[PDB]
Curated annotation (Swiss-Prot), chains A, B:
Protein name: Flagellin FljK
Recorded superkingdom: Bacteria
Subunit structure, interactors included: In C.crescentus, the flagellar filament is composed of multiple flagellins of 29 kDa; 27 kDa and 25 kDa.
Subcellular location: Secreted; Bacterial flagellum
Function recorded in the entry: Flagellin is the subunit protein which polymerizes to form the filaments of bacterial flagella.
Family: Belongs to the bacterial flagellin family.
Organism: Caulobacter vibrioides (strain ATCC 19089 / CIP 103742 / CB 15)
């Protein structure tokens, strides 16, 4: 398929790039916070247990 | 038949030339649009499915 209207390979390449960007953003947050569960979005059960313990 | 009023060979040649012209116009459309089914006339059912999917 030598189409000029679509480019599927670019689509999968962009999906992979966004996955890498998401992983990098997660690592950024985990480094500048110092905690792997800094909010309820990280893991709700352990976050709630840690809030109660604190 | 050495007639001077009727020229059947010219008629057949014109029909063949018109067919070539139509094929060339179809290829011109398929190049400048980039679509083999750019309208309902090219293929009604596949064009309908493509409109719904888009």
């Amino acid at each position: 398929l030598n189409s000029i209207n679509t480019n599927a390979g670019a689509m999968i390449a962009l999906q992979n790039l966004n996955g890498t960007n998401s992983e990098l953003t997660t690592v950024q947050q985990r480094i500048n916070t110092g905690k792997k569960i800094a909010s309820a979005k990280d893991n709700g059960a352990i976050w709630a247990t840690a809030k109660n313990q604190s």
